[PDB]
Amino acid sequence: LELRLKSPVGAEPAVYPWPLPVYDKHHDAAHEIIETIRWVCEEIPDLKLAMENYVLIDYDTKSFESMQRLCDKYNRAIDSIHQLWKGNTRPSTGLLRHILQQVYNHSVTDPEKGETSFDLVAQMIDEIKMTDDDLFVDLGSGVGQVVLQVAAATNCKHHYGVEKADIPAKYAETMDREFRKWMKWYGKKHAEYTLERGDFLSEEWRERIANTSVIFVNNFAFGPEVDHQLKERFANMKEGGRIVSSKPFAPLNFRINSRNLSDIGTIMRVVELSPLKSWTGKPVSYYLHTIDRTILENYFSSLKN
Numbered sequence: 007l008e009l010r011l012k013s014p015v016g017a018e019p020a021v022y023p024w025p026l027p028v029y030d031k032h033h034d035a036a037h038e039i040i041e042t043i044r045w046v047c048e049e050i051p052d053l054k055l056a057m058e059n060y061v062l063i064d065y066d067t068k069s070f071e072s073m074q075r076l077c078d079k080y081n082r083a084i085d086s087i088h089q090l091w092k093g094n095t096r097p098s099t100g101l102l103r104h105i106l107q108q109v110y111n112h113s114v115t116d117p118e119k120g121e122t123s124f125d126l127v128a129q130m131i132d133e134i135k136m137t138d139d140d141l142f143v144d145l146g147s148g149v150g151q152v153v154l155q156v157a158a159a160t161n162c163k164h165h166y167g168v169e170k171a172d173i174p175a176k177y178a179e180t181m182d183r184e185f186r187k188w189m190k191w192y193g194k195k196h197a198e199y200t201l202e203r204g205d206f207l208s209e210e211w212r213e214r215i216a217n218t219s220v221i222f223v224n225n226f227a228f229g230p231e232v233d234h235q236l237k238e239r240f241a242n243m244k245e246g247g248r249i250v251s252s253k254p255f256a257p258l259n260f261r262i263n264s265r266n267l268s269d270i271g272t273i274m275r276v277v278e279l280s281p282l283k284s285w286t287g288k289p290v291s292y293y294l295h296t297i298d299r300t301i302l303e304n305y306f307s308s309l310k311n
């Protein structure tokens with residue numbers, strides 16, 4: 007008693023047991039199956055032609071037979087297309103959102119222990135414009151969704167996620183497995199990444215932060231001691247190093263003077279960025295900090311002149 011979806015690239019099939027799992031009040035495996043089929047049909051125009059029209063319209067998610075017939079029709083169309091062909095690119099943004107949701111639903115089995123975030127991360131990725139020279143770190147990466155989104159979208163040398171908390175770091179291990187598996191199932195390419203359990207305030211992480219060109223950090227809920235210690239870690243970063251955060255680490259209007267020479271504002275430019283400046287989501291801002299020690303050098307040059 008199960009349902010199978012054949013991979014469009016010949017990987018192992020996706021196997022779902024019956025009764026199908028319900029993930030939450032807004033997500034279930036039946037709709038995940040239907041949406042997976044629809045995404046594969048977008049990926050492969052021949053597949054849409056091979057598949058009969060009525061199949062994705064006339065379906066009963068509460069009927070094993072109807073869900074089985076839907077899977078059988080898609081599976082037969084995959085076989086016909088595989089036969090036609092007998093004669094790895096980066097996923098689209100829409101497909102990537104589906105993959106990340108699918109990876110999360112299969113990994114976070116008990117959510118008690120995405121949408122607006124996804125589109126915001128996509129905006130941040132578009133603004134920062136990382137290259138193969140960059141090293142990316144999401145400081146306090148949770149279950150790893152931001153790292154997975156960035157790794158699937160950019161060509162950074164490596165993407166890292168560091169998470170201290172036990173429950174998220176444990177779920178991240180499954181998120182990592184499920185992501186690699188689903189990305190292979192669709193035949194989609196992603197850059198290298200690592201989800202690690204650790205403390206970003208450790209001695210090991212002091213040098214790693216110093217050597218990171220792009221840091222993303224959701225610092226909104228951090229205490230003043232974590233924030234204070236992070237500013238100290240950022241003070242070792244290279245010129246041009248960037249920090250994208252949910253709360254600024256220095257004032258937007260920082261003005262260097264004789265009384266504030268110890269502030270992080272002496273060595274970084276800070277700008278408030280917003281998708282509102284065609285966005286229709288939450289009126290949210292993010293903060294881009296760029297390491298620039300010329301702020302401090304110019305102040306000293308002006309003291310001597």
Ligand SMILES: Cc1ncccc1-c1c(Cl)sc2ccc(NC(=O)NCC(=O)NCCCN(C)[C@@H]3CCCN(c4ncnc5c4CC=N5)C3)cc12
Binds near residue numbers: 206
């Ligand atoms: C996109 C977005 N959507 C909604 C709101 C905001 C945003 C947002 C911006 Cl707006 S900018 C931006 C940049 C990055 C990110 N990334 C993530 O969201 N990444 C996932 C995510 O879940 N991030 C939060 C994980 C929090 N953790 C459980 C721990 C809490 C305690 C601390 N901690 C911890 N870890 C390791 N060592 C440690 C510590 C403490 C001391 N030493 C981590 C997000 C955003």
